[PDB]
Amino acid sequence: DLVEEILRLKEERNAIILAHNYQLPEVQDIADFIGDSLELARRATRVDADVIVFAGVDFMAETAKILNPDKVVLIPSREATCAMANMLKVEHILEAKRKYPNAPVVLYVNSTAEAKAYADVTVTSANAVEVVKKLDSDVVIFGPDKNLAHYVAKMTGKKIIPVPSKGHCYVHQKFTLDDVERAKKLHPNAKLMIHPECIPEVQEKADIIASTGGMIKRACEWDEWVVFTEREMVYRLRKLYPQKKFYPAREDAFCIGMKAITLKNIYESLKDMKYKVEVPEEIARKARKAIERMLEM
Ligand SMILES: C=C(CC(=O)O)C(=O)O
Ligand code: SF4
Ligand SMILES: [Cl-]
Ligand SMILES: [N+]
């Protein structure tokens, strides 16, 4: 029984398991805390445990390590990676800074630690609009996600310089206007919760535009929802609100990187103390400055 083995190893290692909302149901069921990128970042600043097992993708485990440099942070598989975050390279940031030296560099937390070393502040889908609104500039450098950048431009009225030019999430790019039409036909009493990583014409059909954390916060506003994000979010919402109804917009909206994490390799992570997540001190310090500024804003 992997679940009983994991529970005993958690105790033996003085470990906490942090899980993203897109983790497999059986992984969510053994996590101590579950949340979106911003909540996982905040939760990483009050870790009393000695070991963090991060059931999520590599940039998320790195963010936890940046905020807990003297704790052991484990990722259960090094193949748990984010295709969108990998699209942004330091070269892109440097070129944009050359053109707009007075523009703050605003990096989605969906980014490498190397990239965050060049950020003035980080953001998530939950706080991107608030942060960019308060920055002392009418133009900001922003990436990697161009669909979130479109949403931020619309809501703040500021000029958004995307880095790179085509950054996007293949999972959320799957959603189309035909999925909106089918959801409206199959569930005519449901409202639509849509992630800002979806394309702009789908965003415009939303009843609410929100990160997964915002979806959880605003689900109380209606009793039936079609969920335009990675399909494991439906399980999360059904567990939190058993009295509501939730439907996937597309069952095939799956993140391969997220599903590199399994119950078995969480067990192996605790058993073998692997895979240890490390961030170079110079990169971590600079990234930490931008992430702390995000939490302060
Ligand atoms: C990209 C994300 C993923 C999510 O919405 O859970 C974020 O900013 O929180
Ligand atoms: S769902 Fe998209 S943005 Fe999130 S980890 Fe997977 S590839 Fe990255
Ligand atoms: Cl409730
Ligand atoms: N100013």
SSE topology:
Layout: H1 2-13, E1 15-20, H2 25-28, E2 33-35, H3 37-43, E3 51-55, H4 58-67, E4 72-74, H5 90-99, E5 105-108, H6 113-116, E6 121-123, H7 128-134, E7 139-143, H8 146-156, E8 159-162, H9 177-186, E9 191-194, H10 200-203, E10 208-209, H11 212-218, E11 224-228, H12 232-240, E12 245-248, H13 263-272, H14 281-296
Parallel strand pairs: 1-2, 1-3, 3-4, 5-6, 5-7, 7-8, 9-10, 9-11, 11-12
Helix pairs in contact: 1-13, 4-14, 7-8
The protein binds 2-methylidenebutanedioic acid, iron/sulfur cluster (SF4), chloride ion and ammonium ion.
PDB class: transferase
Keywords: Dehydratase, iron-sulfur cluster, substrate analog complex, biosynthetic enzyme, transferase
Assembly: monomeric
Question: Descriptors for this entry?
Answer:
binds chloride ion; Rossmann fold; iron-sulfur; alpha/beta; binds iron/sulfur cluster; binds 2-methylidenebutanedioic acid; NadA_sf; binds ammonium ion; 3 domains; 12 strands; 297 residues
Provide a short characterization of the protein structure.
With 297 residues, the protein is α/β, with parallel strands linked by helices.
Q: How is this structure best described in words?
A:
The protein has 297 residues and is an alpha/beta fold. It folds into three domains: 1-76 and 258-280, Rossmann fold (3-Layer(aba) Sandwich), CATH 3.40.50.10800; 83-169, Rossmann fold (3-Layer(aba) Sandwich); 170-251, Rossmann fold (3-Layer(aba) Sandwich), CATH 3.40.50.10800. The chain contains 14 helices and twelve strands. The protein has helices at residues 2-13, 25-28, 37-43, 58-67, 90-99, 113-116, 128-134, 146-156, 177-186, 200-203, 212-218, 232-240, 263-272, 281-296, and strands at 15-20, 33-35, 51-55, 72-74, 105-108, 121-123, 139-143, 159-162, 191-194, 208-209, 224-228, 245-248. The strands form three sheets. The protein has a four-stranded parallel sheet, sandwiched between helices. A four-stranded parallel sheet has the order 6-5-7-8, sandwiched between helices. Strand 9 (191-194), helix 10 and strand 10 (208-209) form a beta-alpha-beta unit. Helix 1 (2-13) runs parallel beside helix 13 (263-272), helix 4 crosses helix 14 (281-296) and helix 7 (128-134) packs across helix 8. Iron/sulfur cluster binds next to loops. The PDB classes it as transferase. The entry lists the keywords Dehydratase, iron-sulfur cluster, substrate analog complex, biosynthetic enzyme, transferase. It forms a monomeric assembly. Crystal structure of Pyrococcus horikoshii quinolinate synthase (NadA) with bound itaconate and Fe4S4 cluster. The protein is Quinolinate synthase A. Organism: Pyrococcus horikoshii (strain ATCC 700860 / DSM 12428 / JCM 9974 / NBRC 100139 / OT-3).
